[PDB]
Amino acid sequence: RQPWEYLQELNNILKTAYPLLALSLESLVAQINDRFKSTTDEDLFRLINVLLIDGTLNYNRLPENTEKNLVKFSTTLLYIRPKFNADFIDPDYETYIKRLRYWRRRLENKLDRA
Q1: What DSSP string describes 37-57?
Q2: Which of 25, 30, 59, 98 could lock onto 93 through a cystine, CB 3.0 to 4.6 A?
Q3: What's the angle, vertex CA 64, arms to CA 58 and CA 70, rounded to 5?
């Protein structure tokens, strides 16, 4: 609240001092924020990783909530929709690893060609 208001009150007190640098670093911040911000099929490997790693984890720990999340993230996969469906329709963990690993196999094979 008022301390969170005091946080901005510091920020103005920050902005009041040496503000060219406060301009420039904020300018630096957004500059680096923008030009480096990239997701060119990167979430796809980030998806294939976090799923298959969680998936074999529970499989050795012993696919319902696995199938329930499988539609959930394929929804977040907004091309983007068909393989989200094609993985959602294609189950036991043995197929679920094997397809997603083969999916990761080409996705690594694709991204390495870049």
Answers
A1: ---SSHHHHHHHHHHHHHHHH
A2: 59
A3: 85
